[PDB]
Design a protein around this ligand. Structure first.
Ligand code: FAD
Ligand code: FAD
Lengths: 473, 473
């Protein structure tokens, strides 16, 4: 549950046409868009929703917690449903994939109960998200026709939809599954590795890249996380390319660039691809296939918008259009699209790719660009870091050390990103840095920023101030 | 212990004049200023320091922790000393009050070892701080000539200097002291009320204002803290003006315009007033007597600076000159004065009066203006608040409710202040708001800010985002 009334953007209907709005996809992005449109303009527009899945408004972000038994069950993993959306005024078509769009006639055709259902629209909103990518691996193939990404080989898994996590959790039941291999060391793979380990399985995390969380944290923090997993029994196999998943009728072994591992299950957490084929080429696309949208989430075709993982978003850190597949962006782009499609001019403000991760008590957060990625992208970047206790040394209890990294542009002086890591939750602190980047705050201005002082909470010369003052480049 | 090398503001000596710089006062403001000057420009300048007290670089902020025995005595309540400052290159005179300044001959006269000592300067920096506020109360006077705020009536106490708390602790010895009255319900009085209660004494918190923490939090949260104190036996006597402290040779009773209370000790924690007598009418002063300074901390007399509690500061919440007596500000203004005094053009950026308080496990933070205060200043302000749990309902442990309030200008839409309260540490969250106020971010823009999402840390529709979206005015 997470509802409210009109947003502060909602404004008088005045003299705008009433619009019939078709929404394709109803997970994070679609649900946020639909709720915003109905709770704000309600009766003024006709909202029709289509989703090919048998369930919607699912919290995929909580699958690892469920698999790792960090939560009782799947109950709280849904933030809405067909009934709730309908109670807001929407017409919802479940298990009805939209299969074609006619932009001239302005209709979409979906398969409703095995029959072609044609639906007219004034505004069209794409919230189709993305699909898991299958790398070229011998023995890894998808059973054609499954909108659920089912592999032909038994115990070879993908983890994106609710069914996937349920399917995995089910199989984790039989004692036959003792060893699990997780392919891909991004945040999803890392979370999954912990989950299987927590379930008591022998885990091996494999990736062709030389470390985990690459592109999100700099070397010393990825090393720290890596050490964190190893000290919990997770075997790391970085710098290795998976060549094959073999076995007689089921997964029994995973073969890589330089090794072979006996495993009873393989999870592929390599990446996703935007679902933008319905564009039929009529819409401008980003290089990865994402619908290219402006700050109002509008595509190159007037009246048609795109939100969430199926579209781009403006990145204030890099200051260029980008593609950041996060539930956080899904919600905000959905809200922006909602208002614009309903006649309210609302321009988005871009994002910083802010994110957090928590594995075995090690908490980390980052926003913007790591030093590595900044340099890799042609920024004359530098990093200023500091490690110090959260509170004054005289505090007898509840203290802990924190490591902060602030990446800034040596030239323009603007802050490009920041990372924080500690054994206690200081995630709230990254919000300031997300805002800093958004607003173009420089490392010099940050250094003097009003950071309050209270002995029980922090030090007079807190690590943010110390790091900023210590900028040497 | 918060030392560091050069700041990011330091720059090549180029063709600048080094100079003789005299610093009057060496607590928070003076120490930070002295260190910035000696560490960044060391050799090029001659620094001489005068301080009328027998101890410098004290963390008065921890006296309540000290008194209430939450920490091991004054152990770590000092961030520097005479030896450290001299080793850095400064000449330090302890127990040497500066009794007059000759702005014409540009020289100061101090009492060193009971004899006048003149010192010439090219630059003068006032870090004389503040003194306790002492309204008209019969029986309450500071002994003539004491530079330690010693009351003439036995057991009547002020709490500002190291000796002041050692003195209170000394008095707390004899079991005869059973009841203590704390006059002033701001954060200091509230912290002291808890300290005396932890020491097992009966406490009565008296204030002319109808509530505690007036001007820091809105009635909503001050009620929370009031009930929090009462749940520990502290008696609240708000809406009462103390008229007299009486007794036969010592404190025995405190009288207000509404009641009379039988007490064995009285602590006056009404507030701070700028200590600017040395101005001699030659320097422009703020409405409260503070040295009126610009963004460079420079007074109306060129070459003369004022920092910390004896000077004003720019408030980005009210967008005007103000007086905010905080250690955080003392340190920042000292750094700015240091650089400018040494030839480096450094323009201050103002503050938001950010602050925090933690009593009996109730943690609160605020920055900028409260709705009441904003209105008291003529702002056509509004507030948008939200209360919800920090994390999703499915989180087994570590979850807790948080209440947030965001005050904004209905006209300009800029954020004027924010407050947060919870029984778990969410204090890092106020930093984003402090920055938002500094940058003049609007409520509309804040609602779309990129706030990351991780189930272990927060909710997709977190309370910051929800509060902003809920702006009604
Ligand atoms: C294991 C895991 C953990 C994650 N953790 C986090 C995290 O902690 N924090 C964070 O910010 N993000 C996280 N994410 C990313 C986040 O889940 C995605 O960014 C978000 O789900 C995208 O939402 P969406 O609505 O854009 O797309 P999707 O969730 O991909 O949904 C698209 C929807 O549209 C439907 N659809 C597609 N095509 C059609 C069609 N042709 N016709 C009808 N319907 C269609 C689909 O059935 C689906 O319901 C995580 C992802 C995974 C897999
Ligand atoms: C109980 C208490 C709790 C507090 N808690 C917090 C908190 O949690 N967070 C926060 O930000 N702030 C807090 N403060 C406020 C903070 O302590 C002040 O803002 C800060 O001390 C001001 O520093 P300063 O150097 O400007 O002045 P002061 O501390 O007043 O020092 C001025 C110095 O100059 C010397 N001096 C004065 N006149 C002369 C003279 N004529 N000749 C020679 N020397 C002279 C004095 O001896 C003194 O050492 C608290 C204050 C108190 C009393």
């Amino acid at each position: 549950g997470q509802q409210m009334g009109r947003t502060l953007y909602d404004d008088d209907d005045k003299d705008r046409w009433g619009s019939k709005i078709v929404v394709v996809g109803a997970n994070h992005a679609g649900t946020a868009c639909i709720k915003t449109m109905l709770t704000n303009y309600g009766d003024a527009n006709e909202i029709v929703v289509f989703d090919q899945n048998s369930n919607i408004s699912f919290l995929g972000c909580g699958m690892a917690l469920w698999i790792g038994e960090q939560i009782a069950g799947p109950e709280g993993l849904f933030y809405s449903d067909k009934e709730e959306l309908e109670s807001l005024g929407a017409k919802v078509y479940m298990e009805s994939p939209v299969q074609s769009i006619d932009y001239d006639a302005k209709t979409v055709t979906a398969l409703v109960d095995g029959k072609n259902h044609v639906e007219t629209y004034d505004k069209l909103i794409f919230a189709t998200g993305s699909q898991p990518i299958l790398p070229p691996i011998k023995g890894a193939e998808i059973k054609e026709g499954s909108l659920e990404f089912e592999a032909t080989l038994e115990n070879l898994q993908f983890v994106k939809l609710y069914q996937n996590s349920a399917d995995v959790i089910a199989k984790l039941e039989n004692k036959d599954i003792k060893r699990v291999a997780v392919v891909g060391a991004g945040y999803i793979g890392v979370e999954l590795a912990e989950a299987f380990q927590r379930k008591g399985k022998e885990v091996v995390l494999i990736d062709v890249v030389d470390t985990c969380l690459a592109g999100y944290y700099d070397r010393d923090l990825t090393d720290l996380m890596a050490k964190n997993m190893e000290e919990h029994g997770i075997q790391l196999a970085f710098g290795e390319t998976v060549k094959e998943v073999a076995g007689n009728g089921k997964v029994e072994k995973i073969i890589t660039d330089k090794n072979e591992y006996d495993v009873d299950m393989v999870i592929l957490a390599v990446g996703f691809r935007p679902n933008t084929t319905l564009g039929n080429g009529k819409i401008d696309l980003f290089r990865n296939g994402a619908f290219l949208v402006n700050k109002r989430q509008e595509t190159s075709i007037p009246g048609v918008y795109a939100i969430g993982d199926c579209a781009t978003i403006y990145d204030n850190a890099t200051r260029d259009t980008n593609y950041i597949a996060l539930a956080s962006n899904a919600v905000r782009t959905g809200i922006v699209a909602a208002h614009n499609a309903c006649g309210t001019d609302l321009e988005g403000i871009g994002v910083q790719g802010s994110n957090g991760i928590s594995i075995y008590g090690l908490h980390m957060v980052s926003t913007g660009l790591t030093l590595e990625k900044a340099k890799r992208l042609g920024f004359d970047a530098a990093v200023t870091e500091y490690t110090d206790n959260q509170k004054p040394e005289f505090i007898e209890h509840g203290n802990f050390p924190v490591t902060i990294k602030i990446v800034y542009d040596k030239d323009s002086r603007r802050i490009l990103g920041a990372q924080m890591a500690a054994r206690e939750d200081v995630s709230m602190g990254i919000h300031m840095f997300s805002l800093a980047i958004q607003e173009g705050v420089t490392i010099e201005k940050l250094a003097l920023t009003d950071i309050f002082f209270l002995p029980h909470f922090n030090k007079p010369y807190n690590y943010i101030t110390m790091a900023a003052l210590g900028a040497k480049d």
